[PDB]
Design an enzyme around this catalytic site. Structure first.
Site, mmCIF file in Angstrom:
data_model
loop_
_atom_site.group_PDB
_atom_site.id
_atom_site.type_symbol
_atom_site.label_atom_id
_atom_site.label_comp_id
_atom_site.label_asym_id
_atom_site.label_seq_id
_atom_site.Cartn_x
_atom_site.Cartn_y
_atom_site.Cartn_z
ATOM 1 N N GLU A 255 0.819 -1.209 0.000
ATOM 2 C CA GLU A 255 0.000 0.000 0.000
ATOM 3 C C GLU A 255 0.856 1.264 0.000
ATOM 4 O O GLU A 255 0.631 2.157 -0.814
ATOM 5 C CB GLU A 255 -0.962 0.024 1.189
ATOM 6 C CG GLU A 255 -2.076 -1.010 1.105
ATOM 7 C CD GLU A 255 -3.071 -0.738 -0.020
ATOM 8 O OE1 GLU A 255 -3.002 0.342 -0.635
ATOM 9 O OE2 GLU A 255 -3.911 -1.621 -0.308
ATOM 10 N N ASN B 229 -7.382 9.049 -5.891
ATOM 11 C CA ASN B 229 -8.167 8.120 -6.688
ATOM 12 C C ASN B 229 -9.021 8.827 -7.726
ATOM 13 O O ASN B 229 -9.255 10.036 -7.644
ATOM 14 C CB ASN B 229 -9.034 7.293 -5.758
ATOM 15 C CG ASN B 229 -8.217 6.554 -4.726
ATOM 16 O OD1 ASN B 229 -8.273 6.864 -3.537
ATOM 17 N ND2 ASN B 229 -7.436 5.581 -5.175
ATOM 18 N N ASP C 293 -12.085 8.763 -8.279
ATOM 19 C CA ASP C 293 -13.358 9.265 -7.773
ATOM 20 C C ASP C 293 -13.197 10.552 -6.975
ATOM 21 O O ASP C 293 -14.185 11.115 -6.502
ATOM 22 C CB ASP C 293 -14.100 8.196 -6.950
ATOM 23 C CG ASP C 293 -13.410 7.845 -5.627
ATOM 24 O OD1 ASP C 293 -12.316 8.366 -5.312
ATOM 25 O OD2 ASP C 293 -13.985 7.015 -4.889
ATOM 26 N N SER D 77 -11.491 10.773 -4.174
ATOM 27 C CA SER D 77 -11.066 10.448 -2.820
ATOM 28 C C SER D 77 -9.554 10.283 -2.801
ATOM 29 O O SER D 77 -8.910 10.248 -3.857
ATOM 30 C CB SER D 77 -11.724 9.170 -2.319
ATOM 31 O OG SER D 77 -11.232 8.050 -3.026
ATOM 32 N N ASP E 245 -6.253 8.204 -0.597
ATOM 33 C CA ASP E 245 -5.778 7.203 0.344
ATOM 34 C C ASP E 245 -4.620 7.797 1.126
ATOM 35 O O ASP E 245 -3.754 8.471 0.558
ATOM 36 C CB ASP E 245 -5.268 5.952 -0.357
ATOM 37 C CG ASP E 245 -6.290 5.328 -1.270
ATOM 38 O OD1 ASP E 245 -7.495 5.356 -0.949
ATOM 39 O OD2 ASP E 245 -5.875 4.796 -2.315
ATOM 40 N N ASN F 82 -8.852 5.208 2.931
ATOM 41 C CA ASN F 82 -9.500 6.057 1.942
ATOM 42 C C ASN F 82 -10.520 7.024 2.541
ATOM 43 O O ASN F 82 -11.271 6.685 3.461
ATOM 44 C CB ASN F 82 -10.149 5.168 0.885
ATOM 45 C CG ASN F 82 -10.789 5.944 -0.214
ATOM 46 O OD1 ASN F 82 -12.004 6.159 -0.204
ATOM 47 N ND2 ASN F 82 -9.993 6.358 -1.193
ATOM 48 N N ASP G 100 -15.497 -4.318 8.552
ATOM 49 C CA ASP G 100 -16.617 -3.726 7.817
ATOM 50 C C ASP G 100 -17.389 -4.733 6.963
ATOM 51 O O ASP G 100 -18.490 -4.435 6.499
ATOM 52 C CB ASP G 100 -16.121 -2.561 6.955
ATOM 53 C CG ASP G 100 -17.255 -1.699 6.425
ATOM 54 O OD1 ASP G 100 -18.110 -1.276 7.234
ATOM 55 O OD2 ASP G 100 -17.295 -1.447 5.202
#
Ligand SMILES: [Cl-]
Ligand SMILES: [Cl-]
Ligand SMILES: [Cl-]
Ligand SMILES: [Cl-]
Ligand SMILES: [Cl-]
Ligand SMILES: [Cl-]
Ligand SMILES: [Cl-]
Ligand SMILES: [Cl-]
Ligand SMILES: [Cl-]
Ligand code: NA
EC number: 3.2.1.17
Length: 129
Positions: A35, A46, A48, A50, A52, A59, A101
């Site tokens: 990562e 990202n 979209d 967003s 990280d 995120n 989650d």
């Protein structure tokens, strides 16, 4: 901060990540390697919009607030900047929520594609744990 491998393993264990939700420490270290390359200041924008953040590239769409991800949530109740600290407490606490989650560590694309099913024990080889 750029952690060394065993240094990160030790810090993750201190913060209770080892075997959290059944994921051995090596999974977490492997995830962090791919990562962030062990860099707490790692960031990735990202498509979209967003971003990280941190050693586990957590995120902003769900987990932290950065003020620039419209419609997003802040489930870890932290500014995303907290995930960039030399101190990994916030990243670990948030990772715990993420991995609970529903999809386990598949939440981390690099874990799924580069760690899952591999010899993750190697990531804590030599480490005095
Ligand atoms: Cl550095
Ligand atoms: Cl180290
Ligand atoms: Cl390494
Ligand atoms: Cl392991
Ligand atoms: Cl936002
Ligand atoms: Cl929220
Ligand atoms: Cl905030
Ligand atoms: Cl730490
Ligand atoms: Cl699971
Ligand atoms: Na957010």
């Amino acid at each position: 901060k750029v952690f060394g491998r065993c240094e990160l393993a030790a810090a993750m264990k201190r913060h209770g990540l080892d075997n959290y939700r059944g994921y051995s420490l090596g999974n977490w270290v492997c995830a962090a390697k791919f990562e962030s390359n062990f860099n707490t200041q790692a960031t990735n924008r990202n498509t979209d919009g967003s971003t990280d953040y941190g050693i586990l590239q957590i995120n902003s769409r769900w987990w932290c607030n950065d003020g620039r991800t419209p419609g997003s949530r802040n489930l870890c109740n932290i500014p995303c900047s907290a995930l960039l600290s030399s101190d990994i407490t916030a990243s670990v606490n948030c990772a715990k929520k993420i991995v609970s989650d529903g999809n386990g560590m598949n939440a981390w694309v690099a874990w799924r594609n580069r760690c899952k099913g591999t010899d993750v024990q190697a990531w804590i080889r030599g480490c005095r744990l």
